RNA sequence: CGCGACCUCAGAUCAGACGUGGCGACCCGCUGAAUUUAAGCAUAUUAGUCAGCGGAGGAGAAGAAACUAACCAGGAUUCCCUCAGUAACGGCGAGUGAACAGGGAAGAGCCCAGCGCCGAAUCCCCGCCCCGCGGCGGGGCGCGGGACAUGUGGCGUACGGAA
RNA sequence: UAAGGCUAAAUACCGGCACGAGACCGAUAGUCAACAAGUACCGUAAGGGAAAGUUGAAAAGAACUUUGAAGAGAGAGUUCA
RNA sequence: ACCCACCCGACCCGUCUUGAAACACGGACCAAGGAGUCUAACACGUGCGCGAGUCGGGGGCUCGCACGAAAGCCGCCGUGG
RNA sequence: GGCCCGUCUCGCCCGCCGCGCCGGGGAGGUGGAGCACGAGCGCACGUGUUAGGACCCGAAAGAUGGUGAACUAUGCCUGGGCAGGGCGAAGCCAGAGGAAACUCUGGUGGAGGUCCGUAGCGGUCCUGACGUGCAAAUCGGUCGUCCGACCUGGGUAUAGGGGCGAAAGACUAAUCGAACCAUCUAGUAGCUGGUUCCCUCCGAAGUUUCCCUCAGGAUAGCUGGCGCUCUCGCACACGCAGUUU
RNA sequence: UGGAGCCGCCGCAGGUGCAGAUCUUGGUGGUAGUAGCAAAUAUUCAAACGAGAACUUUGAAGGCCGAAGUGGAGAAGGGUUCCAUGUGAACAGCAGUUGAACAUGGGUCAGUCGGUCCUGAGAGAUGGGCGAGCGCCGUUCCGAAGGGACGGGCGAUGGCCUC
RNA sequence: CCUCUGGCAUGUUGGAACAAUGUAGGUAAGGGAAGUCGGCAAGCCGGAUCCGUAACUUCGGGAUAAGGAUUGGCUCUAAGG
RNA sequence: AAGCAUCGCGAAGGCCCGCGGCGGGUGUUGACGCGAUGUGAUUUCUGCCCAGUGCUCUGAAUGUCAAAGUGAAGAAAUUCAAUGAAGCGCGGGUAAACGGCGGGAGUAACUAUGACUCUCUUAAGGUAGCCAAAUGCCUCGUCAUCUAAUUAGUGACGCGCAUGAAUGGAUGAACGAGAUUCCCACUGUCCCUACCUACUAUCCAGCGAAACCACAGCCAAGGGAACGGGCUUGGCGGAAUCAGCGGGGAAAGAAGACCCUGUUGAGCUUGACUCUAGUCUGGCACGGUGAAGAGACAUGUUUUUUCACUGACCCGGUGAGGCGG
RNA sequence: CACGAUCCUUCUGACCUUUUGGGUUUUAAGCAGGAGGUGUCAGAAAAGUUACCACAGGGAUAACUGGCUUGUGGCGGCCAAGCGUUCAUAGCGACGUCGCUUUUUGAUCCUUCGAUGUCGGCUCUUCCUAUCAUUGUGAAGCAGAAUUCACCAAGCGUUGGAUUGUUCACCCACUAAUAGGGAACGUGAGCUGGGUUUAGACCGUCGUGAGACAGGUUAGUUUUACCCUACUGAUGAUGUGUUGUUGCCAUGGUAAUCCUGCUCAGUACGAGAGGAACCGCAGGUUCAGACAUUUGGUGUAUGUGCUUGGCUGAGGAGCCAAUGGG
RNA sequence: CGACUCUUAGCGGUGGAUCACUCGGCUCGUGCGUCGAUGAAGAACGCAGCUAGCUGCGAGAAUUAAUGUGAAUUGCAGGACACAUUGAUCAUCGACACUUCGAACGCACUUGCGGCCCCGGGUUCCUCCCGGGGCUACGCCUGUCUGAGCGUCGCU
């Protein structure tokens, strides 16, 4: 399926 | 977790010792009747320059006392050896430079190098570059001699041993600075894989006792067993007194 | 410094034999975990189990008691039923765990070393003849070799045996 | 009665050769595999590993005419279809 | 029962949830596949046979088994449970 | 009430081939999954509870045995490659001065992990392009380095708790804080998700105590099912209640 | 419609009923004739062939690569891609009269160019050692590790037994 | 950067337009970092000759420091074998 | 990285590999070497602390300390005794080993600070230096400077939450796609935008995907799992589409990296609990010969100590070439 | 209330049982009662770390928003002891008391953990008023000027910079004024990424250590729109028989703003110092809508010169150098 | 009515469910129970008139011989044969044959180098050269031959 996101880059990131 | 450098110079392969280019093995002449009883003379055809050793080696060519064939040797030139000189060695050699006789009949005094630790061993001691041994004193009884090596340890062995009169060529090779990383780097390529070295500090905590911390700092004591399984025996080993 | 016995050892494209790999359901010999269970886990358990290595046969292994028993006693091995989820083991927890007797399937018993007696009475290989030859055998005949007394063959082996 | 040895039988058998049967499955099932399957294909390699059965009784599988460069059609014909 | 009209009613299912139309998750659509099984052990309930007995295995005797790998029988009927 | 077995308390008598540290009884308590004119055995079906892949699907892991250094890491062997400029180190020459020591001036010389800068090697910034791309990391401009710890082909060595690492836990075939392949394996899950026809009747719980128990079990409770024993609207009733007196 | 088997009742048996599982396999929609077919300056005119030309070929013109090449030759890797003739179904993200597509045939000639021989880093048998074992270590180390040569002698045969 | 030898047909298509957004290039009056986290981005600078060159310094450097001037075309002259 | 500095080792050795070997790597090596650490050119320095944790040195003078061996009683299993290795303890050394390095009071003829004095305390009590640093909480520290204006920059100050000497301190030319601050120049970075070019987007011929999708698709308020496209009450609603656009679909992406639970894991650590390769020591075995003597018990036995010997065993050398008489 | 199961150990008890072919004796095993303890007390034997991290799940549970709440913060009343030379209330207001608000922060845990992109700034629209300025007014302890207090009122405004990632803060400068707020703490398929908040590293403190630090520092990938809707513009649609024309207007939207100078006037007022206002006139700010005569910018008319390197043998005429340069 | 959209039906497409078949599996059982240096299993390369794959075979290569059978084989060709004849075709399979690797065997894996005996061309044993044939692995057993040792003896 398609890449989207990098491995590193985690979307919705919210810590 | 990780074996440590160290561990895996033993296994070799990497860390095995570069050795195409070097002349040959740089012993002394073998015992026989020659050598026992009188002296065997014998030429030094050239001297030589051998890769990863300081000190240089000549190719001296005697004849073989029972076929007719010219043998050759190399030795470790002793400081003042040159091209088209004689050297002789022997019981009834002469304490001349560059002219191995046995440390019994050499006097007290006698410097001397390529020295036999074990007599007939082909010379084993004092044989680096500007290094030498000194013969103490003799114990004719037990047929016994007392050698000074280049470590300052005083050391026991059997008159019948023999050394090369003389330094060892090639003196004060270490007075140089190397300055550049590359000098250091062309010295130990000729040698083996031990060159550019990390420190086990700089190491994460799996490859070294020493690593890991968010402070390059050791964290326990640099000092260790020597009775200490191979992998923590680290740092300074069965250190006696560790400072300046 | 010879020649000759033997003894121990070599070398042969010496004569003639054998072994080597495969397969691997079943079988024999080692080796040997961990998931797992214990509501955690380390002993235990999973399990002498999977994986690993070796060696077989049409079957293998086992087998003619250094056995069971404690009876008024049975009598090689193997297999089935039962004994028995028992006696026992076990952080006596989880769990594990046989045997004897009894009834069946089948049923078969033997040979050496030794101790002894018998002219080594024994064996292998050569070579010539008669038969037989697609599982190399019989009979005869050879001062033809060797093996063998550091022990071959017959009798004989605990149920007793020999004379 | 140990520290030597042999021994058929009842017993085992998801490999092999050759057979028989089934309250089984019936082509996304049943073996990975009803078919040119350990095939094609992938992976450096160890290894992984498919899909894919059916015209009709018989090929009688559409002569011939015509449109079109042809593929394609329109009539004609075969067939119980 | 096919379509259309009108009035009234009427939020999307499945699901976990005290509480789902939810700004909770799964779900574009259709076909086929697809999940409480089998073995063992116990327990209680129920049906049948026999009853201080009951029992069947395991074995054996009766057939080349077409149906049978059944069916029948056994001072084995009871070693034994 | 009684009997049997254990156990205690108290007591008095019997028995004989063996008279004894023998054997046998009695009365009264008390432990027993006991007896007190038997109900089991076999088979079948159902429900429940387990052990098993165990309703179906689901880990992160763990183990055994093998395949890889064609990428990349490092060593070794043998080959190949690196315009044009700048700075101008030692050495050398001349001349001038110096009383000597030696010093100045002009040349020559071409040193260096030296500078600029091409090919090569790299990959700073634009947080530029692209971002279902040309591309599972590419493109442009701009940059770092460019005789050395330089770049590079082939050969060869090191293999998985192992290698290799100028050290970033980096790299080890798009995979690395433990590679890949097959097996053990349907690994285990107190946790997500799902779990297939109709009608009919009954119909809950979130409270109890215990638990390395608090997203789970156990045990009571609440539910259903199966029943049985009796009762009498068959002129002819006893007992029971989420009352009241 | 289809063209060969199928049902009722009484019993027995089950791999027995689907809407969901980001379920499995196969198929199809809306999105949509949409996003898109924009890196590296460039095309134009005529004729030919042909059913058919923006794209084939020939000619003419204009352009680029600009000897660190978009030129001419090799290594590794590919494996017939090479060359010719024919086809226009499919493929070559428009087209095609074209192609590295498809179908027919053709094509690689060595004493001297390379493999081949040598040793390199290394790999690796035997002896020896270890090893339950498949094996491993080891490569000069715990080896009786040379089968060759010359000259002389003696024997044997093959040859104008002369040499 | 331009050309010959040799090689190509603009990199998987064409045509017609010349809107917005973009991607890639340019230019801008007056001001000159007021922009922004930040001179990010771009722009200045650039070659050679001739002058001229600071602090500091490990006395090597710093150094193309900084800061200036000149540069075309044509016709001659002189100097180097 | 050079430079500096520690440590081990004279080869039956140090360090290291390996399941095993009279195995192997360093090593074709021998201290100007091999191995193990730290710091990080030059310059200039490198203070005190050996109490703690490490490391190491010595060892019948000696607490404990195992198996075997020795004696003891016992019918025997046995128990009891003495004996006693390393290691612990005991005693020295070691900081360029890990590391560590203070707190009150009073005091100077204006005040203030405090040279000075008093204590209490450690193993010393932070020395040289250096500083609101990449280290300072308070903090936008104070003073200066830089600006019209400075939570920034520089220079000073030092009271230093919590600086400081090879855990290196202080320095420092040259160098840096390193981190800041200011100035000159230059500029569309901005005031404040405009115009131009190419390739797109746009329209056509030809060709032609994907993600995503319960149904769908206008709002306000209400209530509702406390922010509705749908429900209630209102506003309202007109085919089919084009180019744009980024408000909303709590848009797409990926069974939340955060957080918490799980009796689920891994990587790493150590004073966790349980083990283990390795290593150190003791015993028995291969293990022999002779000499001497010495105690202990007993009135021969055991313990053996030391010194030889060589035949096992080991090592080295060699083409095993002259060995001992 | 002052305490503890199995297993194990220990002690005590009886002319006790067993110790297995029989017998004697040691030993061991039983039977029955104490004791040795599990305080997580119905009873495993057990330390850390992870920013290198992983898996199953959880809105049963935090870190936003949004709900409720409003202590705390903000804003506003009542009462009136006082202040205000005098006089409670022009302007204030103690001791007490009643409220509102959700632009503070807490409580809380309802929603979301098969993820609603986590601070600021920039950009843009709209809404509120608790009104800083401007319009019209009431008040004064309002002579004038300056002014605070209050009312209608949100039409129009509310800036440029220095430091800081900041919000906030402060300062400079201008101004009529430099009022305060909301919109998922408006606004990441709008940007940016300076900061928080992965991985690299440095320092200090803490930790034996791995490592930790709402302690400091530096380096660090910001994806997708072509769907629906919304909005912006663009074709069209049903009707009117078809077609054109010129028109009306339902409904939507909507816009203007504030200032300076002159004059009134050194006038009113005022002891003086100082010092207004209405009507006029001249202009400007911000905003809006246009336009290109002029000035400027652009410029590939590739218009016309000029020029570098090359290329057509040269002249001439030209071309190439991704727009050769100017 | 107009286009579009929605619904329903008819026909047509797309797609391949369902049903019906089954030279295949799965399970249970019976009998036998056999590989290899005389070269296995496996691998490779070859072989057909037209043949790629599968299958079958080995330079005698879709098979030879033999035996049984008794007219085909067949996609098309072509043929054979007298099918009153060992005789088409199948089956069986006892004779014969069986390329190269592979335990794999002269040594190496290039398909490279060899040694030693015999034979034909080549010579006229002249060795060369070419071609052909047969030997040339390791281990171990019985014997055989040649040997070794300051191993243990004897005689000289
Ligand atoms: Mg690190
Ligand atoms: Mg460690
Ligand atoms: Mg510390
Ligand atoms: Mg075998
Ligand atoms: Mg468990
Ligand atoms: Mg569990
Ligand atoms: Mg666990
Ligand atoms: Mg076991
Ligand atoms: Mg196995
Ligand atoms: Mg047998
Ligand atoms: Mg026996
Ligand atoms: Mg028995
Ligand atoms: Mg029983
Ligand atoms: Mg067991
Ligand atoms: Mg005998
Ligand atoms: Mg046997
Ligand atoms: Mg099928
Ligand atoms: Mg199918
Ligand atoms: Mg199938
Ligand atoms: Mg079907
Ligand atoms: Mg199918
Ligand atoms: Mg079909
Ligand atoms: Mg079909
Ligand atoms: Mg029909
Ligand atoms: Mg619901
Ligand atoms: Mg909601
Ligand atoms: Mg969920
Ligand atoms: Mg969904
Ligand atoms: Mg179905
Ligand atoms: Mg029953
Ligand atoms: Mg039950
Ligand atoms: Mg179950
Ligand atoms: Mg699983
Ligand atoms: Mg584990
Ligand atoms: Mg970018
Ligand atoms: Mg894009
Ligand atoms: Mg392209
Ligand atoms: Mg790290
Ligand atoms: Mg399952
Ligand atoms: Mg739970
Ligand atoms: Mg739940
Ligand atoms: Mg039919
Ligand atoms: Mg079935
Ligand atoms: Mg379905
Ligand atoms: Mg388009
Ligand atoms: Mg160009
Ligand atoms: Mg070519
Ligand atoms: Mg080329
Ligand atoms: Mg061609
Ligand atoms: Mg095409
Ligand atoms: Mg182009
Ligand atoms: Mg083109
Ligand atoms: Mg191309
Ligand atoms: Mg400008
Ligand atoms: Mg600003
Ligand atoms: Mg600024
Ligand atoms: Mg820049
Ligand atoms: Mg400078
Ligand atoms: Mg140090
Ligand atoms: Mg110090
Ligand atoms: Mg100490
Ligand atoms: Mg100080
Ligand atoms: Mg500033
Ligand atoms: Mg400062
Ligand atoms: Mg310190
Ligand atoms: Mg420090
Ligand atoms: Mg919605
Ligand atoms: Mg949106
Ligand atoms: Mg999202
Ligand atoms: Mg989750
Ligand atoms: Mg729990
Ligand atoms: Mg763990
Ligand atoms: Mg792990
Ligand atoms: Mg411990
Ligand atoms: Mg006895
Ligand atoms: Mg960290
Ligand atoms: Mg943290
Ligand atoms: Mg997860
Ligand atoms: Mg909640
Ligand atoms: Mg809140
Ligand atoms: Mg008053
Ligand atoms: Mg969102
Ligand atoms: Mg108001
Ligand atoms: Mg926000
Ligand atoms: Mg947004
Ligand atoms: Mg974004
Ligand atoms: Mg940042
Ligand atoms: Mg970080
Ligand atoms: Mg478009
Ligand atoms: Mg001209």
Same mark, same amino acid.
Not at chain 2, 93 to 106: C, D, E, F, K, S
Not at chain 2, 162 to 178: E, H, Q, S, T, W
């Given at each position: 399926g398609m890449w989207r996101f990098y491995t590193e880059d985690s979307p919705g990131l919210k810590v | 977790g990780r074996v440590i450098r160290g561990?895996?110079?033993? !296994?070799?392969?990497?860390?095995?010792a570069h050795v195409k280019h070097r002349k040959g093995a740089a012993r002394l002449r073998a015992v026989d009747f020659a050598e026992r009883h009188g002296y065997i003379k014998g030429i030094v055809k050239d001297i030589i320059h051998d890769p990863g050793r300081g000190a240089p080696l000549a190719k001296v060519v005697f004849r073989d006392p029972y076929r007719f064939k010219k043998r050759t040797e190399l030795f470790i030139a002793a400081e003042?050896?040159?091209?088209?000189?004689?050297? /002789?060695?022997?019981?009834? *050699?002469?304490?001349?430079?560059?002219?191995? #006789?046995?440390?019994?009949?050499?006097?007290?005094?006698?410097?001397?190098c390529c020295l036999e630790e074990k007599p007939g061993d082909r010379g084993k001691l004092a044989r680096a570059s500007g290094? /030498?041994?000194? @013969?103490i004193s003799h114990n004719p009884e037990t047929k016994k001699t007392r050698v000074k090596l280049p470590s300052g340890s005083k050391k026991v062995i059997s008159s019948?041993?023999? *050394?090369?009169?003389?330094?060892?060529?090639?003196?004060?090779?270490?007075?140089?600075?190397? #300055?550049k990383a590359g000098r250091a780097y062309h010295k130990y390529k000729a040698k083996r894989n031990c060159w550019p070295? @990390?420190?086990?500090? !700089?190491?994460?905590?799996?490859?070294?006792?020493?690593?890991?911390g968010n402070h390059q700092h050791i964290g326990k004591p640099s000092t260790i067993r020597r009775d200490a399984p191979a992998g923590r025996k680290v740092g300074l080993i069965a250190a006696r007194r560790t400072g300046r």
């Open positions: - | 561990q895996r110079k033993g !296994a070799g392969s990497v860390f095995r003042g050896i040159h091209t088209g000189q004689f050297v /002789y060695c022997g019981k009834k *050699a002469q304490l001349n430079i560059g002219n191995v #006789l046995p440390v019994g009949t050499m006097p007290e005094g006698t410097i001397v290094n /030498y041994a000194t @013969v019948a041993n023999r *050394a090369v009169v003389g330094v060892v060529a090639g003196g004060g090779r270490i007075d140089k600075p190397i #300055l070295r @990390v420190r086990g500090v !700089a190491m994460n905590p799996v490859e070294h006792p020493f690593g890991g």
